[PDB]
Amino acid sequence: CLAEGTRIFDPVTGTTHRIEDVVDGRKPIHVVAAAKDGTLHARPVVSWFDQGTRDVIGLRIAGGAILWATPDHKVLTEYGWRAAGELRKGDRVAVRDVETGELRYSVIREVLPTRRARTFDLEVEELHTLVAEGVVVHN
Numbered sequence: 001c002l003a004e005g006t007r008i009f010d011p012v013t014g015t016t017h018r019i020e021d022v023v024d025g026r027k028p029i030h031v032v033a034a035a036k037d038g039t040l041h042a043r044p045v046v047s048w049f050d051q052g053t054r055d056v057i058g059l060r061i062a063g064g065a066i067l068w069a070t071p072d073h074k075v076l077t078e079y080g081w082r083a084a085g086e087l088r089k090g091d092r093v094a095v096r097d098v099e100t101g102e103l104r105y106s107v108i109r110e111v112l113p114t115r116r117a118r119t120f121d122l123e124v125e126e127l128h129t130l131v132a133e134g135v136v137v138h139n
Helices: 018-023
Strands: 007-009 017-019 029-036 040-054 057-060 066-069 074-077 080-083 094-095 101-112 119-122 130-131 136-139
Touching: 007 130, 017 018, 018 040, 018 119, 029 119, 057 094, 074 094, 074 101, 074 136, 094 136
Parallel strands: none
Antiparallel strands: 007 017, 029 040, 029 130, 040 119, 057 066, 057 101, 074 080, 094 101, 130 136
């Protein structure tokens, strides 16, 4: 689940939407999806649900790029899918590059202890996956 504050760039509109705003108003919009091929494809949202308030961790990546998600949220690492609570300053994550638009790999900058905030839930067509804070991790 994604925490409030996470930005979501839409390929259809080309702007930046906030999950807190997209879910609260279940807005029929689109998002970027990822497959096992590593390629990015736009996909519509067909479900919006609130996950309640729970503890979440903050993953800081080089460039300031940060992502807040639940410990059960799986992150796309070099070794497949790994729970966020299993990430330590040294784990590399895939982040979308606006320069080449293509997928790129970067190292973490610092791990942020658990906190507390509202969390949301989405459903991307079938390719359960969405781009959040430039980072690609299951919905």
